[PDB]
Amino acid sequence: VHLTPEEKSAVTALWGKVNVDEVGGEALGRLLVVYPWTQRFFESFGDLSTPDAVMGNPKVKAHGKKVLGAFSDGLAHLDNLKGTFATLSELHCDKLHVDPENFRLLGNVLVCVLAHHFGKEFTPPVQAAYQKVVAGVANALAHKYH
Amino acid sequence: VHLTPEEKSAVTALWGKVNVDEVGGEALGRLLVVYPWTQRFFESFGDLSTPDAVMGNPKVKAHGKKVLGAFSDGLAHLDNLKGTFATLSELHCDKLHVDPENFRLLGNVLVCVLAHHFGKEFTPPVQAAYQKVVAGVANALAHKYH
Amino acid sequence: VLSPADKTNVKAAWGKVGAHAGEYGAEALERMFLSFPTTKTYFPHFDLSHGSAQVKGHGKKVADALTNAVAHVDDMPNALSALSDLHAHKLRVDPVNFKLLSHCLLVTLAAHLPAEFTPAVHASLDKFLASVSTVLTSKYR
Amino acid sequence: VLSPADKTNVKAAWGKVGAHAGEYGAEALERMFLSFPTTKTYFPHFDLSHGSAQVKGHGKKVADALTNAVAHVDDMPNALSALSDLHAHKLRVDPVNFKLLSHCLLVTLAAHLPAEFTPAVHASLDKFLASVSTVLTSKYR
Ligand code: HEM
Ligand code: HEM
Ligand code: HNI
Ligand code: HNI
Structure with missing residues (x-):
């Protein structure tokens, strides 16, 4: 999970x-x-x-x-997603008992919602940057499962 | 990968x-x-x-x-699978055009083959350690795709 | 299985796509190659960069197959039989990639059809694309 | 689809398993919980201690359902209909987990069937377990 500087800029610009x-x-x-x-x-x-x-x-x-x-909040810490989401990972595992596959599903649904809201502005390169983000977030939320 | 000291020992022992x-x-x-x-x-x-x-x-x-x-080679350098398999990752992507999903298939076939050979000796904890290994190898082999 | 409402929703949404089917198929493929670089392993012989005639031509083929499936929505295993034969014996794409293309088709449709891409329609389209994918991987072994 | 050869292989392999099926179901669950800890998210209400009777009870239910599916291998959708309803409406286990249990079932069978677990039988069993899984997730949406 490594976004290029231009992808980081694109993510931040759209999120604003x-x-x-x-x-x-x-x-x-x-x-x-x-x-x-x-x-x-x-x-x-x-x-x-x-x-x-x-x-x-x-x-x-x-x-x-x-x-x-x-x-x-995670978008501000794209180079340390595992650390960023560590306490939430532990919570979703230990207290909430949520299969982390659900994080992957939600990430792609979020991408669909961004496309729906932004239309043409949600270009293929912008999508690709956001796919790196949602995969990184899902992977981080899964990371402390045990 | 993040094998425990005891799992590292168990993997090495079985592999010998x-x-x-x-x-x-x-x-x-x-x-x-x-x-x-x-x-x-x-x-x-x-x-x-x-x-x-x-x-x-x-x-x-x-x-x-x-x-x-x-x-x-992977088993001999469990803390840097990504480094160990970088050259081979580039090969499988650039020259061989192998979808990395196949690495997961091979990993689990290998686990079946270890179970088939070792029988009861391939205990549930030993299997769990080997699942970390084969996931780590697949992920490392997938890492230099682009 | 597709419900009566699913089929209504798919017919309405894909009908609205209309003449854009080929353009949207090519856009979904582009989105897939950029978002999920492992999918490019199946196309070593293609130019995959933006504006590729090969990607445009392939997008049209994909879109036309979906149009045929919508037309034969109650008989997709048979309507897609020749295509599933090709997938099983020649193309041999790992099943995970169909989920990646399906998602990119949904994103494409969302980006173009603001009023039509409702939650219920999104649900029906996802089921439809999964059903097509299932048929296309049904003869692998 | 399961071929006559697949059906032969599955019936022979499961026949060999015989009365050990329940034990092997529990073993497969234990292997799954250890190897793929996310699967434990579906069992927070269970006692998951070593040799858990509750896990063993569950292993018996899983095994018995598989024995039934083997006995009804020509029409699994019908034989598993009530179980598929329960999975869709109550249990609601994400589809990815079925592949995890199926793999652990294969590992368990491999570990107990040195003579019987040939490459062809391995292939047939994998197809069978995938087919059972497909029926169990068939009514999800
Ligand atoms: C981007 C991914 C996700 C993020 C960042 C996230 C974040 C959060 C946060 C901040 C909370 C509040 C924590 C608390 O109560 O202390 C929460 C609660 C919860 N989350 Fe997640 N979550 C994500 C995905 C999911 C998914 C996909 C599911 C299940 C489908 C899920 C299930 C739950 C549940 C059941 C709760 C507790 C709800 C309640 O209070 O009744 N989460 N999540
Ligand atoms: C995940 C574990 C894997 C490892 C450790 C691995 C390792 C290797 C090695 C060491 C070579 C020889 C490279 C050389 O000659 O320099 C090789 C070649 C190759 N690998 Fe893999 N591989 C793996 C998985 C796969 C899979 C799953 C496939 C396809 C399904 C695959 C397809 C190939 C092909 C087509 C070659 C070239 C064979 C030839 O000489 O024609 N590899 N691999
Ligand atoms: C990531 C890989 C990939 C996926 C997921 C995928 C998913 C699908 C889906 C699913 C919704 C549909 C309807 C579809 C339809 C088609 N594919 Ni796909 N294909 C894929 C890789 C290919 C490849 C590779 C070819 C050959 C292209 C070429 O021209 O060489 C192909 C060719 C086709 C053709 C042309 C066949 C012919 O020559 O008669 C059709 C139509 N398809 N493909
Ligand atoms: C990782 C989770 C998981 C998977 C992949 C899975 C896969 C399967 C497979 C696939 C080969 C079979 C044949 C099977 C069969 C069954 N499951 Ni599963 N189950 C799973 C989690 C459950 C849970 C949870 C229950 C409820 C148990 C309880 O006692 O509360 C369950 C309940 C059942 C029952 C009992 C139903 C009843 O009460 O009548 C049977 C039979 N099953 N499960």
């Missing part, structure tokens, strides 16, 4: 335009719609019975903000 | 009992039998038309032994 709260809710929502087995982790969030019930679920949306906040 | 002619031929042969599409990379090896033909093929047997030779 992201509504992190909105995008987080949308990414977590689409994860739960597209891969509905992932709803297993969110029973407490209430109604997840239809795509609209999931996407507009306020608890899903609020949780998406946390997720994207932590992601946003 | 490995017959490389038998295990190397069996591992490469079974890759080509179990995942027959991988035969695409070995057309020059001649007759690969049946399982017996693959397993008995002198070039498969010789090549499997060469492959284990490289694995042995």
Whole structure:
């Protein structure tokens, strides 16, 4: 997981335009719609019975903000992702019992959401930079599992 | 890779009992039998038309032994698999055009072949250590792709 | 399995793609080669750089196969039979790569179809692409 | 698809396993938990201590389902229908984990079947376990 300087610049430039709260809710929502087995982790969030019930679920949306906040924070530490995500890795393993495959799924859903929001601006080179990022984040979140 | 001191010892001990002619031929042969599409990379090896033909093929047997030779180098330098396999990673990418997903297939076939030979001696903890090894080798061989 | 709603959604979204099918197929391939460099191992004989005639031509082939699959959405194993034969006996692409191309097709569609790429439609398209991928890898062994 | 030869190989190999199936199921689970620790995320409610009776109980259920699938090898989707429902709607294990358990099942079989685990039988067993896994994830979405 090594972005070039130009890729780092591209990632930072695009992220400045992201509504992190909105995008987080949308990414977590689409994860739960597209891969509905992932709803297993969110029973407490209430109604997840239809795509609209999931996407507009306020608890899903609020949780998406946390997720994207932590992601946003990781973008500031692209050369130390394992360290950045170490305590969250331990938490997702020990307390939450979340299969890290879910981090890979969410990363690619987030890429879809960025493409949906940005359209043509989400160019193939911009995507490739973000793919390095989401793979690095997923790998970091998996790293302290045991 | 991140083998514990005790797993490093266990891997080294088992490997000192490995017959490389038998295990190397069996591992490469079974890759080509179990995942027959991988035969695409070995057309020059001649007759690969049946399982017996693959397993008995002198070039498969010789090549499997060469492959284990490289694995042995890995096992002798577990803290720098990426460095150990850099040249071979470049070869498999630039000259051989081998999708690294195949390295994971070979790794797990090797684990099956070690289990088949050693039986009960290939204990669950010994297997777990070898899974770290084969994942580490595949990841190192994949590292210089571009 | 594709539900009645999945098939409605796929037909509507791919129909909206319309004349852009070949362009979008080529864009998805480009996105794949840049994002997932291991996929380039299957194309040593191609120019893979931007604007490649070979990538454009291949994108059109891929897109046309998807159009045919949509047309025969209830009989994809048979409609894609010749193509699955080619994949199993010649191309021999590891199954993981189909997931990479599928994802890049979704990204392409998302980038071009703001109103149409809803969560439900995204779900149906992913299922559809996985179903096509399953058929194309079904004869490997 | 499982060929007549695959079906022959699988029936012969599992027949040899016989009453050891439950023990081997538990062993495969233990191998999986140690080799692929992420799989333990599905068992936080289990006692995972050494020689766990709860793990052994589970190994028996897994093994018994496989024995049934072998006995119904011509129509696995039907034989495994109720189990596939439970996987889709309750257990919800990510599909990647099935490959991990399948590999650990092969390792276990290899370790216990020195004569029977030929290259051809290895291939047939791998296809069989992948087919079972496909049926078990078939209703996920
Ligand atoms: C970019 C990847 C992810 C990041 C950065 C992330 C981050 C976070 C953060 C900051 C929290 C709050 C921690 C706390 O409560 O102390 C959290 C909680 C949680 N996460 Fe993740 N997460 C990610 C992916 C996922 C995925 C893909 C899933 C499952 C599909 C998941 C499941 C959970 C669950 C179940 C909680 C607790 C929810 C609750 O309070 O009920 N996470 N995550
Ligand atoms: C993951 C562990 C692997 C190791 C350690 C390894 C090692 C090697 C070595 C040492 C060579 C000889 C290089 C030379 O002559 O300088 C070689 C060649 C080669 N490898 Fe691998 N390899 C691995 C996996 C694979 C896989 C999985 C495939 C394809 C499915 C593959 C395809 C090839 C091919 C086609 C050659 C050239 C054979 C020829 O001379 O025609 N390798 N490998
Ligand atoms: C990363 C590799 C890769 C993937 C995932 C992939 C996924 C797919 C998918 C999945 C949605 C579809 C519908 C599809 C369709 C096609 N592929 Ni793909 N192909 C792939 C690598 C190829 C290669 C390689 C060729 C040959 C290209 C050439 O011209 O040499 C190919 C050729 C084809 C052709 C042309 C066949 C012919 O000559 O009749 C079609 C159509 N395909 N490919
Ligand atoms: C890594 C996780 C995992 C995998 C890959 C997996 C793979 C498989 C395979 C594939 C060959 C088979 C045949 C199989 C069969 C079964 N599983 Ni699995 N299961 C898994 C995690 C579970 C869990 C968790 C349960 C619930 C256990 C409990 O007792 O709470 C489960 C429950 C079952 C049961 C009991 C169902 C019931 O209550 O009626 C059977 C039978 N299975 N599981």
